Structure formats: structure tokens, C-alpha cells
Design a protein around this ligand. Structure first.
Ligand SMILES: C=CCNC(=O)Nc1nc2cc(-c3cccnc3)c(OCCN3CCOCC3)nc2s1
Length: 193
């Protein structure tokens, strides 16, 4: 297994996301959403909220266990490792192809955040920013796709709606939501089984 840095993704984005048009753009969404869905499939979290922000960024929020908040080697957070080493893999690929990315993790009474910029260079460490009830857990990821890479950076509400509907149907007993802050449009999907 040859590990790579995020430069590799940025130099050959098609190898990771298929293309740099709208299909590629929306693959970034699918990677992040899929990580939230896997966590719910494992039984952690009953809602996954997706927001298309006014600034063009996109947020996915789950209520799963929260990415681990500890360290890997050399004082590097586990989360930073997940987001910055390519095991070529979703999180690091989206980070690489984003002009900025923020991950917020809530667990154990604490809220932590790390911010990356300019294709996934950390501009902070994983820092405690606040507190929450001990019962509160989850992961939140927000990213701004890199307009220097994609031919289009406009997320399409209908495209995302359809994919989240399908994901809700396959998962069962989990609410998937989409809110578009550009247009105020909103929808929820939930299939009981
Ligand atoms: C919100 C947008 C995308 N949503 C997400 O990405 N949600 C995620 N939720 C988790 C939860 C865990 C997790 C797992 C176990 C215990 N506590 C938390 C996790 O661990 C990383 C894999 N590790 C686990 C430790 O052993 C090596 C493998 N990753 C994610 S990623």
C-alpha cells in the first residue's frame, strides 16, 4: 500500500472522482454523505442533515459516535490523518479538492474543530471549541469545492435530493434532509421498515 499526499489527488482528480464537471462535483457530496450513512448503518445516528449554504459550500451533519478525537503519531490528530493521507479514501479526496474544509466533532462533553484550506492544508489543529451535553455525539463536515479545479461549483438541489431519497430508502429508519439556503427549498426523507 503506497500512501500519498493530497497533491496526488489535485493533479489527477479524474482518477478519484471520475471527472471535474458537475458529476465530479457531486461525487464530493456522495463521499461525505456515504461516510455519514455507513455510520448510521452501523447503528449510530438516526438523522443525516445536508445543507447547501449561501456561500456555495455544502454541510453534512451526522449524529453518530463522532470521529475519534485522539492522536496518531507525532501529536497529529487521527482526524487530520483521515483528512490528509490518501490510502490510494473519501474524506481526504474531498479535502484535496476543496479550497476549504471544516470538520466538527462532538463527543464526551466536548466540541472539537479542525479547519483546512487550499486543498487540504491544516490551518488549525483539532481544537476544542466548546462543550455539549455528554449525550451529544456526531460529526459535521463542511467544504467549499475548489473553483480552480471544477468547471462548475453549483450544487444541484434536485440531484442531491434524488440521491438522498435513494440513500434513505436503502438505509431505513434514518431521516435524510436537504436544505438549500440559496433558494430556501427543503425536503426530508424517511422510510420506516
Ligand atoms: C458528517 C459527515 C460525514 N460523516 C462521518 O464521516 N461520520 C463518521 N463517523 C465516524 C465514527 C467513527 C468511530 C468509529 C469507532 C468509534 N468511534 C467512532 C469513525 O472512526 C474512523 C474509523 N476508525 C474507527 C476506530 O478504529 C479504526 C477505524 N469514523 C467516522 S466517520
Amino acid at each position: 500500500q503506497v500512501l500519498e499526499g493530497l497533491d496526488a489527488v489535485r493533479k489527477r482528480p479524474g482518477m478519484y472522482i471520475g471527472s471535474t464537471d458537475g458529476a465530479g462535483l457531486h461525487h464530493l457530496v456522495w463521499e461525505i454523505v456515504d461516510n455519514a450513512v455507513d455510520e448510521a448503518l452501523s447503528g449510530f445516528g438516526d438523522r443525516i442533515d445536508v445543507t447547501i449554504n449561501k456561500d456555495g459550500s455544502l454541510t453534512v451533519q451526522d449524529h453518530g459516535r463522532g470521529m475519534p478525537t485522539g492522536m496518531h503519531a507525532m501529536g497529529i490528530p487521527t482526524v487530520e490523518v483521515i483528512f490528509t493521507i490518501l490510502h490510494a479514501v473519501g474524506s481526504s479526496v474531498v479535502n484535496a479538492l476543496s479550497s476549504w474544509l471544516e470538520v466538527e466533532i462532538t463527543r464526551d462533553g466536548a466540541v472539537y474543530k479542525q479547519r483546512f484550506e487550499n486543498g487540504g492544508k491544516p490551518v488549525t489543529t483539532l481544537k476544542k471549541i466548546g462543550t455539549a451535553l455528554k449525550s451529544k455525539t456526531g460529526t459535521k463536515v463542511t467544504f467549499m469545492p475548489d473553483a480552480t479545479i471544477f468547471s462548475t461549483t453549483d450544487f444541484k438541489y434536485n440531484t442531491i435530493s434524488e440521491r438522498l431519497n435513494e440513500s434513505a430508502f436503502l438505509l431505513k429508519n434514518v431521516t435524510l434532509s436537504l436544505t438549500d439556503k440559496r433558494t430556501d427549498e427543503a425536503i426530508e426523507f424517511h422510510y420506516e421498515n
